[PDB]
Amino acid sequence: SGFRKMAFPSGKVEGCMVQVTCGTTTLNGLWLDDVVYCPRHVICTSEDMLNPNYEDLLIRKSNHNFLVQAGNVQLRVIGHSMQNCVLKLKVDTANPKTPKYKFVRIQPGQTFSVLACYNGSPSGVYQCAMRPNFTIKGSFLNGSCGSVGFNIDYDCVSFCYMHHMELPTGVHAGTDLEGNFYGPFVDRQTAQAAGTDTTITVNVLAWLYAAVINGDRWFLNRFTTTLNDFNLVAMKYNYEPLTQDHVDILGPLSAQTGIAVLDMCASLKELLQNGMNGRTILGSALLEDEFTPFDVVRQC
Amino acid sequence: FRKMAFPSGKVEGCMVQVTCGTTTLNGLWLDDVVYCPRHVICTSEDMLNPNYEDLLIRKSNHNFLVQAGNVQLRVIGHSMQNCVLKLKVDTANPKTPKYKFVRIQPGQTFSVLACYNGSPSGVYQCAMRPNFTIKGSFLNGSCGSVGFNIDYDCVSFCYMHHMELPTGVHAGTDLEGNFYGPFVDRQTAQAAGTDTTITVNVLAWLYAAVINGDRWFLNRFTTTLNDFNLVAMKYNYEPLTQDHVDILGPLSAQTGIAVLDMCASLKELLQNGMNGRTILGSALLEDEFTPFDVVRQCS
């Protein structure tokens, strides 16, 4: 058995992490080609954070107010711009370790690796999924702001997330690399409410299909259900509703197996009403919702 | 709370592919030596009952193909240290980091860079099980994958994957070829013993829940080591020692909760259960966070 959670190797991202210091505020930055991307609230003090006028604060700053440091080599800022909620610091030196890279914006349910960094120095890497309430549940102590999330496909690094804020319940919020926030959040110390976190239904079904492929089949039933009936029961257990698009994505797994999607949906309904009863599925005593269909399909 | 693995950059540059005949696996390139499992010289027929000493005197330096990406390294020498083959190559690895070879003990944690044909594919944090096995995602082609820890600039290599057991678990050696556990490198029926739960690691995780504010399991009672070790053994939990109490001492001062006071909470959670509740999000008690892991990820 076994579906352990693997994070992506982080070497290509480690050589892109820098330290940015504006005043007495220090966070992490992303050094690609000749630009350093960092959260724009690096220019704010704790008092400016409640009601920040970002345009008033930046007009008053000069290139020399920004200290960018890659290890011990200091970089020279020759220009600055603000794209949405990120600051773009143009430097005199290009990053020699720049990898092949893209910027992508992800949707809830999608997975990625996070390189947690403190003061320009990498400390750990973990795999996570964007929650349906646009939050991430990781370990981000004060100083991780600027840490990024990424996926590696054939030597191309796809940067999809940058950490900005810690929400009061312990969860985290951030933007894509273009500075657009994921969810309704803002970079102010206001009271912001994360919505209800729900279970990613399409991800549980893909993992249950992987269980059948690897032998575990004790949860299967002889029944089937319609989508409208399944969605009505799943709402009661805080499960995301299933759309026709989710059914079509699970198609390949329903062909390798003989179980139709609406048949797996009937089995999941029975698991929710009964429990696991001391038993385990692929080594897990809990239903896993952080494995996307794409990943299961590729690893059959 | 999340199980974070070490950054893998310093090890990614040392991964190579070793091919002898039809067998292709992963090797570790440090200075001018390539380390890899010695069963790379064995055919499927030889694996039944192998005489490695004889199978190697026949092999020559031209029977080994070592590839670092697109460059091909030239083997100019070979040797065996226990269950690891050491291939001397012509070029030194310019990405050799500050490194050391250490042997760890059951219950200790480390990160594994799972590789396939010399290509790094994934990284994960795991703990050496008390039965000397590791639960992991290795699949096939991952033989020679390495486990490591990072102390400042020094990478400590502590494990190399050799075999997969039919329980879905994996077995291996240290970098000096000394196996962890009663396994041998032959295709035979091999069985892992009763896996027990690492008690010192659960107590460290309970200290982290209190640091994080989850303090419901806390009780006014205290127990003694022998009193708890009875319930521990009955519930398949590793006996606790005085040294275990001394290592948790730091976390006992950041919290105010003493080890035997906290042991009375664990005893209640084993017999009574969570009475329908959650600690740090789980219904189960985690045992793959050492006391040192908790101190570094929190304090």
Contacts of B107 (CB under 8 A, 6+ apart): B127, B128, B130, B198, B200, B201, B238, B290
Residue A22 makes CB contacts below 8 A (sequence gap 6+) with A42, A43, A61, A65, A66, A67
The dihedral region occupied by A39, where left means phi > 0, alpha psi between -120 and 50, and beta the remainder, is: beta
Q: Across the interface, do A9 and B12 touch by the CB < 8 Å criterion?
A: yes
Domain B199-298, what architecture?
A: Orthogonal Bundle (1.10)
- B84 and B38 in contact (C-beta within 8 Å)? yes
- CA dihedral B133→B136→B138→B143, nearest 10 degrees, is -30
C-alpha distance from residue A172 to each of A131, A154, A159, A235, B183 (Å):
10, 29, 17, 25, 44
Q: Provide the experimental method for this PDB entry.
A: X-ray
Find residue B126's DSSP bridge partners. B110
Nearest to B277 by CA among B202, B203, B201, B216: B216
Q: Which residues of A touch B (CB under 8 A)?
A: 1-11, 14-15, 115-116, 122-126, 128, 137-139, 141, 170, 283, 285-286
Structural contact between residues B79 and B52, judged by C-beta atoms closer than 8 angstroms: no
Q: How far is CA A16 from CA A83, A99, A225, B38, B171, in A?
A: 20, 9, 50, 37, 35
B183: its two tokens: 């396994």
Q: Which residues contact A237 (CB under 8 A, 6 or more apart)?
A: A199, A272
Helix (H, G, I), strand (E, B) or coil at B92: coil
Q: How far apart are CA B75 and CA B89, in angstroms?
A: 4
Structure tokens at A229: 């009936």
Q: CB pairs below 8 Å between A and B: how many? A: 83
Write out the DSSP string of B190-232.
-------B-HHHHHHHHHHHHHTT--SS--S----HHHHHHHH
At B169, the amino acid letter reads V
Distance between CA atoms of A102 and A236, rounded to whole angstroms?
39
**Dihedral sign for Cα atoms in the order B271, B275, B276, B281:** negative
Residue B48: DSSP 8-state? G
**B248: three-class secondary structure by DSSP:** helix
Q: Which residues contact B267 (CB under 8 A, 6 or more apart)?
A: B223, B228, B231
Query: What resolution in angstrom units was achieved for this structure?
Result: 2.1
Among residues B112, B93, B102, the alpha carbon closest in space to that of B30 is found at: B93
Tell me the residues of B at the A interface, defined by beta carbons under 8 Å apart. Answer: 1-10, 12-13, 113-114, 120-124, 126, 135-137, 168, 212, 282-284, 297-298
The number of residues in chain B equals: 299
CA dihedral in degrees (A26, A98, A104, A10; nearest 10)? -70
Q: In what order do the strands lie in the sheet with B23-30?
A: B71-73, B64-68, B15-20, B23-30, B33-37, B84-89, B75-81
| Fold of the CATH domain A201-299 | main proteinase (3clpro) structure, domain 3 (1.10.1840)
Token digits of residue B95: 């990405």
Q: Please give the CATH topology (third level) of the domain spanning A11-91.
A: Thrombin, subunit H (2.40.10)
Chain B positions in Cβ-Cβ contact with residue A279 (cut-off 8 Å): none
Q: Tokens for A246, please give them.
A: 């989710």
